[PDB]
Write a protein that binds this ligand. Structure first.
Ligand SMILES: N=C(N)c1ccc(O)cc1
Length: 338
């Protein structure tokens, strides 16, 4: 009943914001640009500083014309509408959003510890306790998102930032969607795609549980379970129903992963009648205090090294390009609801 009532309140609060989204809550010249933190085919993320408060933020800037060209309109509207409505300890907070003649802007909390990906690659692999600490946070986050009828669809180490307490903050809702039943879009990252996405089926939240299996494997091994030089070769491995485990994996870890990396979605943990409880009650999680994780009372495996809220040492270096705003409005109609 405790979990039922928690998730019922969570859904009520989400739906109120979902139905009446916030809009136009800052503007670009309220911020100073500090550094580019990441780049993609239609946008970038920039460390900015608010000129009046001095607070640092990560500002995601999407070029409207590129969003249209790369057929990402609905996805960008999903991302903003979802992010402004969610509230969970392991989800990055959206603080402002706005648009101008050229771009869409989402201003989010800045997490100076950087991406899990960097730390994983620096250390090689995480011990099982360390992987389990992060995995537990993802399990709770997916329990929350799925109870709101949301599918995340982009779980991977680059989208999980490590905060000042060593806890995860999930970023990048670009593929997240509110789904009743099935959805069909081909999206994600090749190594993390569930078989039913590769096979062009209508799929559901089970794809997030598959991706959790991939993430746990990668955290504990140092490399993902399905790897190859070309995506088609990765996809052949994903659909095959075969996975090999390093000998150092515990038996409990192997068993959990066989049930998350189950090619038959109707047999996959997280998608059975007992839902998330098949995962939470698995022996690999026997040492996990779920409430203590949620309350952020567990001491983390490591605290990232950084000097202060504006330090960018844990992020890498990108060419610094202009944020140009056209004199003329672009794509106004397509982005009316943003
Ligand atoms: N670097 C960050 N703190 C960050 C990155 C991406 C994002 O979508 C949100 C926040």
């Amino acid at each position: 009943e405790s979990v039922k009532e928690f998730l019922a309140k969570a859904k009520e609060e989400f739906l109120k914001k979902w139905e009446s989204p916030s809009q136009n809550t800052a503007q670009l010249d309220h911020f100073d640009r500090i550094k580019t933190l990441g780049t993609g085919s239609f946008g970038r993320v920039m460390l900015v500083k608010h000129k009046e408060t001095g607070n640092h933020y990560a500002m995601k800037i999407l070029d409207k014309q590129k969003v249209v060209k790369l057929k990402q309109i609905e996805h960008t509207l999903n991302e903003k509408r979802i992010l402004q409505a969610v509230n969970f300890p392991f989800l990055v907070k959206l603080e402002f959003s706005f648009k101008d003649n050229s771009n869409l802007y989402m201003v989010m909390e800045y997490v100076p510890g950087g991406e899990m990906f960097s730390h994983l690659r620096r250390i090689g692999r995480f011990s099982e306790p360390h992987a389990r600490f992060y995995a537990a946070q993802i399990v709770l986050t997916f329990e929350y998102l799925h109870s709101l009828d949301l599918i995340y669809r982009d779980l991977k180490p680059e989208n999980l930032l490590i905060d000042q307490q060593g806890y995860i903050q999930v970023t990048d809702f670009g593929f997240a969607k509110r789904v009743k039943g099935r959805t069909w879009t081909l999206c994600g990252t090749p190594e993390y795609l569930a078989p039913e996405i590769i096979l062009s089926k209508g799929y559901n939240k089970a794809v997030d549980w598959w991706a959790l299996g991939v993430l746990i494997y990668e955290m504990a091994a140092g490399y993902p379970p399905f790897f190859a030089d070309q995506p088609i070769q990765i996809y052949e491995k994903i659909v095959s129903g075969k996975v090999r485990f390093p000998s150092h994996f515990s038996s409990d870890l192997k068993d959990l992963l066989r049930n998350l990396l189950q090619v038959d979605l109707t047999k996959r943990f997280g998608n059975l009648k007992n839902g998330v409880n098949d995962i939470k009650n698995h022996k690999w999680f026997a040492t996990t205090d779920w409430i203590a994780i949620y309350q952020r009372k567990v001491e983390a495996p490591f605290i990232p090294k950084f000097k202060g809220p504006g330090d960018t040492s844990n992020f890498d270096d990108y060419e610094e390009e202009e944020i140009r705003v056209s004199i003329n409005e672009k794509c106004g109609k397509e982005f009316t609801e943003f």
